Each structure stands twice: as C-alpha cells, then as structure tokens.
Amino acid sequence: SRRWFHPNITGVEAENLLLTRGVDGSFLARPSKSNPGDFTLSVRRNGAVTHIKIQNTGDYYDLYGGEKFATLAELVQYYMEHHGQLKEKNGDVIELKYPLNCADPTSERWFHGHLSGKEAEKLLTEKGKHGSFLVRESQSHPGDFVLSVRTGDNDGKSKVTHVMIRCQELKYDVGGGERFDSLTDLVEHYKKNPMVETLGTVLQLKQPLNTTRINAAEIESRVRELSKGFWEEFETLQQQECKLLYSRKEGQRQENKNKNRYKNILPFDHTRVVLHDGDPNEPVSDYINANIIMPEKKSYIATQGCLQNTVNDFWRMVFQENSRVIVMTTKEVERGKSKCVKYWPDEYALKEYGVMRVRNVKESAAHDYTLRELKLSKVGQGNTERTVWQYHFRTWPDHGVPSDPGGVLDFLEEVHHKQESIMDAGPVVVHCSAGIGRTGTFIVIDILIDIIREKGVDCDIDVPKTIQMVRSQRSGMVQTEAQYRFIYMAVQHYIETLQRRL
Ligand SMILES: Nc1ccnc2cc[nH]c12
C-alpha cells in the first residue's frame, strides 16, 4: 500500500516471494544492487514472473515500455488505476493489481536498529518531545525489539516507557492480543489505538525521533559518517513519498495534455502557477506545468523546459509573477534530444512571444554558465519593461552529478546577489527538462545555503526534511541518491569556505 518497495531483496528472493505469497497481478519494486539508481518492477503474470526495468539518471523514472514518472509511488498509482496501459514488447498487458508488502523496517523513520536502552533514553531526553518514539533491537532478549516512548509535559513531568515487542514465528506482538506481520503493522496499529498504562498514561505515538538534523558546523563529520550511510538515509526519505500523492487534476485535463513535456509529470493543483489575463478564445489559458516552491524571503518557481506551444505561456508567467531571474540547468540539447526549446532571442535580437516582447541586450560567458540580460515588456505598454537575468548553467554532466560543487555554488551566489539586488523581485524561475531532478537539487541547495548565509555557521540544517518539504510542493523534487549526496557535498563545501575566511 506504501510497503510494496523491498529495499534489501535480490531478484531470486523477489521471484520466490511472488510465486509463494502472491497471485497473478501481484507485484513489487526493488533496487538493483551494484547498478546505481536502476530499479525493477517485478510482476506475477499467468503463474510466471516478469521483471521490468526502471532507470533514473536524474531527470525522471523511465519505466521500460511504460511512461516516465516523478516518483515510484506516482508510477504505481498510475498503473494500479489504468488497467491496460502497461504492456510487454509483444503487447500483452501487465496488470498491477495487488502490492506484495515488505516487512523490513530499515526504511521507517522510527527504526533505530542496533541501539542500546540507555542511549535511547538520552536521545528522547535531549531531542524528544511528548509522544516521541523509536523502535530498537532488544539486548536482554535477542530476536526481539523494544518500543521506547516519551510521554508528558527536565523535572519529573515527563518519562520514558519501554515496551517489549516479541518476535515469534515470524510475527510481532506487545505481549497479548493481536500478532502483526511487520513492525510497521504493529506501530501503525498502536498509533491508531494507543496502549494505556495500568494507571492511565496513554502511550501516544505522535512522531518519530529526529536524527537527520545537524549543526551546520558539524557537516564534515556527518558526511564522513554517511560515507562509511547515505543510501539508508535516502531510502528512508524515499519511503515518505507515499505521503505526497496530492491531486494533479488540472494537469490531467484534456485541454492541457500537450502542455506537459511528459504526460504523467504534472504540477500539484494546490501549488500550481495559475495564469490569468489570457486569450478569451483559448479553451483553457490558465495552465502551465509549474509550481510555486516556498521554503519553510526568496521563493522559487519550479517548471519544465518549454515546449514549442508553451513558450508564450512561459513568458506570460514570468511577467505575471514579476520574476527577474531565470535559472536554466540543461543545455537545449543533450544526448542528441531536445530538453528545452530556445525561448529567448539571439544576442541583440528582439522577438515577440504572443503579447510579450523580449530583447536580448547582452550575453556574458562565464566558465560554467552564460548570463543573458533580457528585457521583457508587454506589447503596446511602455513603462512595463523590466530586466530579466537568465543564468544558463551549461556544464552539468549528461548523466550523474558534477564531481565537485564549487561551480554550482559560485553560480547560486551570483543568482542570489542579482535576485537580492532587485526591489520586490518575484520568485526565481528554475527549470531543467521535466523540472524535478536538477531543478530540485539546485533549489534545495539554494534553500540550505540561504539559511547558512543568514544564520552563519552555528545554525541547524536538516537535508531530508528540507527535501520532503519541497517534494510536498512539486512531485519528486530531487530524483536520485547521487543528487542527494551532492547536496550534502555542496553544503559542506559552502561551510568549509566560510570557515577558511575566519
Ligand atoms: N521506500 C520507497 C518507497 C517509494 N519509492 C521509493 C524509491 C526508493 N525507495 C522507495
């Protein structure tokens, strides 16, 4: 349901699992082992198992012989409600009917594995609030587990209770009543239906303990401890994408289909940019594949590379939102395929895009990017002209991430100073191809640097929490583990620079 992903499984295992525990229509997804950021959708069809490759090189999930997706959970939702859109080479349908659930708790935010009793009491004391909990392996009774929960209002008014969870022939229970198939089933039961202590305290399971937050100045040590890891921390974050299937109905409307670069990577309704003051003629003129991203001053608009038939809408958007800065993170063409049509005029040229006029005043080549100084106005209305600075990052490698972040960091410092130099500039527009991989990586790095720029080096940052907040505003922002490590590398490199100064 949100447990059809099996992190530490092999092909062999996945096949036996589907052959013993499933039926035709059963399915699961898993990572490939040494293959960086490949995945496999395993499916049982007519008493045999089919494996289907999914690749992510950083822009989107490409399912072989299906479509491209912003998240695996979006992929499963699409096919679990579109009977016959997934097919084999030969055009037989592959039905995804019944998720095959995984019991491994290593991806759950509350699971602290191989942790002691005393260390758990301390973390709940220093980091924990009322209702804060974790599940850890028992040391008294091996095989078993312990649920540890803070309850109350450092002076007596709170306490930590420890509940033993027995493991017995494959099932989990708290000493009586219901026996659960997974620790996740157990936790989800007792979070709905809390245990009540003999004398009446309720063991409310409200939120897991946070272990991702760090002091920015402790970055070097954390990156070193994640390098051994990163994979587990990313996997835990990925698991939480099940929570973000918000509606994308405007993007799914007939009138809007040919405005999406990829027909299933759509903006959420709740944060989509809405275009006003359009043609009365057009059937639907309010739509563009873009979302507002507000951190939780500077906001961003995340959007896809222009299509031929959306260039005019793109400039309607920039004008409406009073954006003065555009960040482009793809070449127009990579691996011989269009990623973004040229929506700006040649140097010294002037062009009309619907009701908008844009002049390219001047281009400046820098090592990692080109800057284009553009002038945007509404045709027939002088004194609406404003300067839009387009920063075009040119050297991002075709697959994977730059091996060093300094180029990226130098680029965002410059984007930041330009933005901050213009009074009431609107949101910075950021776009790549689909507008979720690079685009989210640049935005998330920008959000974190900004904190450090204001609060300096002795401030709290939380990379996965920041990514989760951004993913709640556009599907699948930050696509791959490589991008996740890069974000960390970027912030580390920013912090080192700050301290060599001082
Ligand atoms: N646990 C997980 C749930 C949903 N999607 C993904 C992608 C990698 N891990 C995942």
Q: Phi and psi (nearest 5°) for 334?
A: -140, 145
Residue nearest to atom 7 of ligand 1 (CA): 238
Handedness of CA 197, 201, 204, 207 (dihedral sign): negative
| Residue 363 neighbours by CB distance under 10 Å | 16
3-state secondary structure of 168: strand
For residues 310 and 356, the answer to whether their CB atoms sit within 8 Å is no
Q: What is the dihedral of CA 349, 353, 354, 355, to 10 degrees?
A: -60
Which residues does the annotation place in the binding site for substrate?
398, 432-438, 479
Quick check: CB of 41 below 6 Å from ligand 1? no
**DSSP per position, 401-448:** --S-SHHHHHHHHHHHHHHHHSTT--PEEEE-SSSSSHHHHHHHHHHH
| Residue 54 neighbours by CB distance under 10 Å | 22
Beta-carbon-side half-sphere exposure of residue 225 (alpha carbons within 13 Å): 8
Residue nearest to atom 2 of ligand 1 (CA): 239
Mutate to test the pocket of ligand 1, among 35, 39, 72 (most ligand atoms within 8 A of CB): 72
Q: Give Cα separations from 404 to 88, 215, 395, 486, 498 (angstroms).
A: 40, 23, 12, 8, 17
Which residues does the annotation place in the binding site?
398, 432-438, 479
- CA-CA distance, 35 to 379, in Å (whole number)? 52
Quick check: CB of 238 below 6 Å from ligand 1? yes
Q: How remote is the CA of residue 30 from the centroid of ligand 1, in Å?
A: 8
Residue nearest to atom 1 of ligand 1 (CA): 239
Quick check: CB of 73 below 6 Å from ligand 1? yes
Tell me the pairing of strands 325-328 and 460-461: unpaired
* Amino acid occupying residue 86: L
Quick check: CB of 5 below 6 Å from ligand 1? yes
Beta-carbon-side half-sphere exposure of residue 91 (alpha carbons within 13 Å): 0
Residue nearest to atom 3 of ligand 1 (CA): 239
- CA-CA distance, 362 to 80, in Å (whole number)? 51
DSSP annotation of 56: -
Q: How remote is the CA of residue 101 from the centroid of ligand 1, in Å?
A: 13
Question: Counting atoms of ligand 1 from 1, which one is nearest the CA of 107?
Answer: 1
Say which residues have a Cβ less than 8 Å from residue 172's Cβ, sequence separation at least 6.
145, 165, 166, 179, 180, 181, 182, 183, 185, 186
Quick check: CB of 239 below 6 Å from ligand 1? yes
> Could you tell me which of 78, 79, 76 has the C-alpha nearest to residue 101?
76
For residues 305 and 260, the answer to whether their CB atoms sit within 8 Å is no
3-state secondary structure of 240: helix
Instruction: Sketch out the chain's domains with CATH numbers.
Output: 11-99 (3.30.505.10), 117-208 (3.30.505.10), 215-501 (3.90.190.10)
Residue nearest to atom 6 of ligand 1 (CA): 238
For residues 458 and 374, the answer to whether their CB atoms sit within 8 Å is no
Q: How remote is the CA of residue 9 from the centroid of ligand 1, in Å?
A: 13
Catalogue the active-site residues: 432
CA-based R_g, the chain, Å: 25
For residues 40 and 11, the answer to whether their CB atoms sit within 8 Å is yes
Say which residues have a Cβ less than 8 Å from residue 289's Cβ, sequence separation at least 6.
251, 259, 260, 261, 265, 266, 267, 303, 304, 310, 435
Say which residues have a Cβ less than 8 Å from residue 194's Cβ, sequence separation at least 6.
202, 203, 204, 205
* Amino acid occupying residue 304: Q
**DSSP per position, 277-307:** S--SSSS--SEEEEEEE------EEEE----
Q: Give the E-state strand segments of 282-397 in sequence order.
A: 287-293, 300-303, 325-328, 333-334, 337-338, 350-353, 356-365, 369-378, 381-393
- CA-CA distance, 39 to 30, in Å (whole number)? 6
- CA-CA distance, 381 to 384, in Å (whole number)? 6
Both structure tokens of 438: 């690079």
Both structure tokens of 229: 């890891």
Beta-carbon-side half-sphere exposure of residue 446 (alpha carbons within 13 Å): 30
Both structure tokens of 68: 């491209």
For residues 315 and 330, the answer to whether their CB atoms sit within 8 Å is no
Mutate to test the pocket of ligand 1, among 182, 239, 243, 245 (most ligand atoms within 8 A of CB): 239
DSSP annotation of 397: -
3-state secondary structure of 135: strand
Max Cα separation, the chain? 80
Q: How remote is the CA of residue 423 from the centroid of ligand 1, in Å?
A: 42
Phi/psi-derived region of residue 370, left when phi > 0, alpha when psi is between -120 and 50, beta in every other case: beta
- CA-CA distance, 381 to 98, in Å (whole number)? 59
3-state secondary structure of 321: coil
> Could you tell me which of 266, 258, 252 has the C-alpha nearest to residue 69?
266
Mutate to test the pocket of ligand 1, among 241, 244, 477 (most ligand atoms within 8 A of CB): 241
Q: Give Cα separations from 492 to 220, 336, 405, 474 (angstroms).
A: 6, 34, 10, 26
Q: Experimentally, how was this structure solved?
A: X-ray
* CB neighbour class for 490 (10 Å; exposed up to 12, middle 13-18, buried from 19): buried
- CA-CA distance, 265 to 315, in Å (whole number)? 21
Q: How remote is the CA of residue 235 from the centroid of ligand 1, in Å?
A: 6
For tokens 């990829």, the residue is 262
| Residue 175 neighbours by CB distance under 10 Å | 8
For tokens 């063409």, the residue is 333
For tokens 């590379």, the residue is 305
Quick check: CB of 69 below 6 Å from ligand 1? no
Quick check: CB of 74 below 6 Å from ligand 1? no
Quick check: CB of 232 below 6 Å from ligand 1? no
Say which residues have a Cβ less than 8 Å from residue 32's Cβ, sequence separation at least 6.
38, 39, 40
> Could you tell me which of 381, 382, 363 has the C-alpha nearest to residue 372?
363
Q: Give Cα separations from 277 to 283, 318, 333, 382 (angstroms).
A: 13, 13, 32, 18
For residues 319 and 281, the answer to whether their CB atoms sit within 8 Å is no
For tokens 């409200």, the residue is 206
> Could you tell me which of 179, 177, 147, 151 has the C-alpha nearest to residue 164?
147
Gap sites in the chain (C to N > 2.5 Å), preceding residue numbers: 153, 228, 296
Q: What angle do CA 52, 53, 55 make, to 5 degrees?
A: 155
- CA-CA distance, 204 to 196, in Å (whole number)? 9
Say which residues have a Cβ less than 8 Å from residue 162's Cβ, sequence separation at least 6.
117, 120, 146, 147, 148
Residue nearest to atom 4 of ligand 1 (CA): 239
H or E element at residue 191: helix 183-192
Q: What angle do CA 395, 401, 402 make, to 5 degrees?
A: 55
Q: How remote is the CA of residue 40 from the centroid of ligand 1, in Å?
A: 12
Q: How remote is the CA of residue 176 from the centroid of ligand 1, in Å?
A: 32
Resolution value, angstrom units: 2.2
